[PDB]
């Protein structure tokens, strides 16, 4: 078995960004809201070395005006989805654990825990 150091990374790190996008996309596939949520801010980002790499992300999200009825996943561009304003506006502070392995393309959201703000 292989277990490594838990290290702090920059939120702007390009591989942290991909992990975040995989974390958000997985949340939307399993969330109860009609609207797609979107990452607004990445607060903290750590990485741990395993047979692969685990990414421990603390990040803020926001509900959008984009709906699952009108737009399907895998074909949704969250950059074209505006944050909902008033009445619907819902914010979440989420902890994400993203596993990335070399033999796979799709990263996995292994665990999550969101908390309204």
Residue numbers in the entry: 8 to 124
Task: Please quote the paper that reports this structure.
The cysteine protease legumain can develop asparaginyl endopeptidase (AEP) and carboxypeptidase (ACP) activities in a pH- and context-dependent manner. Primarily found in endolysosomes, legumain is involved in immunological processes such as antigen processing and TLR maturation as well as in tumor progression.
The crystal structure of hCE revealed the typical five-stranded antiparallel β-sheet wrapped around a central α-helix. Two disulfide bridges additionally stabilize the structure by clamping strands β4 and β5 and the hCE-specific appending structure that is inserted between strands β3 and β4.
